Amino acid sequence: DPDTAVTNKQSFSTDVIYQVFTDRFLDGNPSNNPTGAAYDATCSNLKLYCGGDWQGLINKINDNYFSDLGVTALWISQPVENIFATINYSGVTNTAYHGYWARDFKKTNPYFGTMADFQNLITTAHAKGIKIVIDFAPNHTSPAMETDTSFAENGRLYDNGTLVGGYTNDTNGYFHHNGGSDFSSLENGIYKNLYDLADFNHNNATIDKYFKDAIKLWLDMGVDGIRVAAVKHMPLGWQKSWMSSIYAHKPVFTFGEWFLGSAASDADNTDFANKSGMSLLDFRFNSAVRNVFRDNTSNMYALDSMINSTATDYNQVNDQVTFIDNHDMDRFKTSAVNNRRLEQALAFTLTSRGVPAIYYGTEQYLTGNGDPDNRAKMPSFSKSTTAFNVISKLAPLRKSNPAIAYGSTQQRWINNDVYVYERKFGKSVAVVAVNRNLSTSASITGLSTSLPTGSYTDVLGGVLNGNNITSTNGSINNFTLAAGATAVWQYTTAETTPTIGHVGPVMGKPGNVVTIDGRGFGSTKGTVYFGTTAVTGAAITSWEDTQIKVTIPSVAAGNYAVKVAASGVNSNAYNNFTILTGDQVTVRFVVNNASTTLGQNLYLTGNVAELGNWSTGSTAIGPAFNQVIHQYPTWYYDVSVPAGKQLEFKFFKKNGSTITWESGSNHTFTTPASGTATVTVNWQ
Ligand SMILES: [Ca+2]
Ligand SMILES: [Ca+2]
Numbered sequence: 001d002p003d004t005a006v007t008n009k010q011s012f013s014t015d016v017i018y019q020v021f022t023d024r025f026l027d028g029n030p031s032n033n034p035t036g037a038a039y040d041a042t043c044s045n046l047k048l049y050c051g052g053d054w055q056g057l058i059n060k061i062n063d064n065y066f067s068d069l070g071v072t073a074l075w076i077s078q079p080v081e082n083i084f085a086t087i088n089y090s091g092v093t094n095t096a097y098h099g100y101w102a103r104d105f106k107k108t109n110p111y112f113g114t115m116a117d118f119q120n121l122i123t124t125a126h127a128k129g130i131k132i133v134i135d136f137a138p139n140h141t142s143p144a145m146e147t148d149t150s151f152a153e154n155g156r157l158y159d160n161g162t163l164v165g166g167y168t169n170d171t172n173g174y175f176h177h178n179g180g181s182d183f184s185s186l187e188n189g190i191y192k193n194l195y196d197l198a199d200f201n202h203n204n205a206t207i208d209k210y211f212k213d214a215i216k217l218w219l220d221m222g223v224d225g226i227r228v229a230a231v232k233h234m235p236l237g238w239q240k241s242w243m244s245s246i247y248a249h250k251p252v253f254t255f256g257e258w259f260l261g262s263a264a265s266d267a268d269n270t271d272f273a274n275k276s277g278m279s280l281l282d283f284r285f286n287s288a289v290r291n292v293f294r295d296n297t298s299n300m301y302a303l304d305s306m307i308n309s310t311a312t313d314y315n316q317v318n319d320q321v322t323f324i325d326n327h328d329m330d331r332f333k334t335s336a337v338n339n340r341r342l343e344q345a346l347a348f349t350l351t352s353r354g355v356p357a358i359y360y361g362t363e364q365y366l367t368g369n370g371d372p373d374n375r376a377k378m379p380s381f382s383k384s385t386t387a388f389n390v391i392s393k394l395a396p397l398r399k400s401n402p403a404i405a406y407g408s409t410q411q412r413w414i415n416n417d418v419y420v421y422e423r424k425f426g427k428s429v430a431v432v433a434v435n436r437n438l439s440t441s442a443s444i445t446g447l448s449t450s451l452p453t454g455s456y457t458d459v460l461g462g463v464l465n466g467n468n469i470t471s472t473n474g475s476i477n478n479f480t481l482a483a484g485a486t487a488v489w490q491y492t493t494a495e496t497t498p499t500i501g502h503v504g505p506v507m508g509k510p511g512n513v514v515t516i517d518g519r520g521f522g523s524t525k526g527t528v529y530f531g532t533t534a535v536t537g538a539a540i541t542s543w544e545d546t547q548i549k550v551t552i553p554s555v556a557a558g559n560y561a562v563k564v565a566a567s568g569v570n571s572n573a574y575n576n577f578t579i580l581t582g583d584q585v586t587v588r589f590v591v592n593n594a595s596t597t598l599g600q601n602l603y604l605t606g607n608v609a610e611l612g613n614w615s616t617g618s619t620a621i622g623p624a625f626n627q628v629i630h631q632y633p634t635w636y637y638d639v640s641v642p643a644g645k646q647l648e649f650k651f652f653k654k655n656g657s658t659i660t661w662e663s664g665s666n667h668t669f670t671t672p673a674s675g676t677a678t679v680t681v682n683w684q
Pocket of ligand 2: 139189190191192193194199200233234
């Protein structure tokens with residue numbers, strides 16, 4: 001199979017995700033519409049259900065709307081049975097229309113469709129080569145008051161019909177009853193309630209179990225991707241074991257949302273991308289794209305830096321999911337914002353690095369500020385707009401041109417309102433040119449690309465007032481780029497060298513199988529190098545020019561670079577693959593009596609690669625928490641550690657360069673073969 005083929009769950013770099021709020025798109029079947037309180041036919045009261053559902057998308061896939069737009073994937077609402085109760089928050093009736101106030105993860109949302117309607121979608125989709133991607137919220141159930149069972153469904157979690165338990169009188173401790181997060185730190189954002197939503201207790205072994213079992217269900221119906229919610233509000237440790245269990249079983253591409261407010265590099269957000277075993281929505285690229293194109297607060301320089309810092313921060317920047325907007329900010333088009341500015345923002349995003357998503361009806365230039373006005377009933381299905389045209393012209397290149405799909409990003413020309421940049425993968429090039437200025441045109445003199453000699457026609461055919469150019473050995477002849485114009489001119493040809501485009505997943509134990517997308521690999525089963533170790537023959541499950549699939553060798557766990565060798569010649573090196581010791585379980589380590597100093601923090605390390613392998617660097621886990629579950633001078637932390645292994649660990653205070661250890665002998669611990677566990681040591 002191709003890297004391109006819908007068959008490929010582990011990479012989305014060649015796709016364009018269409019994100020659609022299921023109930024606001026199209027009501028295909030009206031019999032699975034709510035009754036009364038919870039329902040609005042006319043969808044004027046956006047807090048109510050509007051009747052949209054899975055048969056609605058089906059019908060659209062079939063009359064070629066998605067395929068004509070060129071989107072190759074769809075990201076639907078979390079599908080699980082949500083609370084049926086209507087919650088009246090200060091005068092206004094709220095319904096669980098948005099698919100987030102779940103109540104049974106092992107069942108479907110009847111207003112969206114049945115299990116068979118779900119399967120139906122999976123199939124009408126894969127039929128037209130459109131990958132499906134679901135939302136998933138392992139952080140919580142629904143709203144609830146501990147003093148008040150009467151409020152909503154009191155966070156009640158039912159396992160497949162059978163009630164496991166609600167918020168009030170939670171004798172088992174399935175939930176953090178720690179108050180609600182005030183958000184002053186990371187720690188309080190995790191172990192206290194997200195707003196008024198009943199917070200799961202993951203260190204609880206029923207719930208740890210439930211959630212791994214609830215995703216295998218969905219993966220088994222053939223979802224091709226998982227968009228995780230509120231990842232800043234759950235422990236990384238738990239997210240990592242949950243993930244490793246998924247990759248073990250049915251590796252799909254998984255990206256999470258860690259909300260960010262700016263193009264700025266946030267540390268916890270970056271460490272999350274690199275260590276979690278998942279990718280994130282690209283909130284910092286979003287901040288740049290709105291600043292330069294919508295809001296005129298920043299200029300062409302901002303955009304280029306953002307490109308460069310995200311390229312530097314992220315272990316695999318190409319997995320990150322870019323966007324001009326979504327269901328939690330205001331809609332890009334607003335009355336002052338020009339069409340061409342939305343259109344250029346689209347243009348830009350489709351041609352840029354990472355994985356592009358579009359929130360529904362951006363082809364229809366939809367407005368709506370804040371929530372819910374940013375979530376309206378999808379207005380028309382016209383295939384007539386300039387945004388409709390730009391998306392369908394450009395998003396195909398992600399598949400046909402590997403430079404767009406995996407390539408590098410170079411600046412070739414920039415001033416305050418003009419940006420010309422280049423995407424290159426091996427011999428394939430693409431240059432995008434953009435003048436954001438809607439009144440002055442701009443002479444580009446002295447442009448040098450690494451396009452070969454010839455005349456290159458604007459791929460957009462002039463829909464965005466694109467002109468044509470001529471390369472003479474890269475040097476482009478002088479030209480006026482028009483007002484508000486944008487151009488794309490590209491070049492492809494067959495690679496004849498193994499070159500690793502993508503690898504997915506990037507973290508797993510021995511025995512897991514990964515996918516290596518690329519160009520010029522040939523069809524003669526060669527050798528795959530996990531670092532220094534050749535994998536050959538039968539251990540390689542598939543070998544095709546663009547995609548090799550291969551089992552993880554039983555090497556020591558750690559960070560590895562992956563190379564391919566075809567016909568003797570070796571490919572480029574894809575980095576930061578994480579081989580895990582084995583299966584993982586989340587274990588909470590609690591250290592008492594660990595007084596520190598102003599600004600002295602507490603990490604743990606130990607004898608396995610998951611614990612950093614006696615590191616005091618970026619692999620030592622830390623810093624530990626010490627305000628919510630346990631408090632100073634006790635310190636605690638949740639780690640992803642390997643199932644049933646004896647561990648040797650020690651805590652240490654790190655100040656500047658002053659690492660200062662635990663005295664005595666190493667502490668030791670044998671982990672469970674499944675689940676979660678807790679261990680408590682006294683700082684010695
Ligand atoms: Ca319906
Ligand atoms: Ca939480």
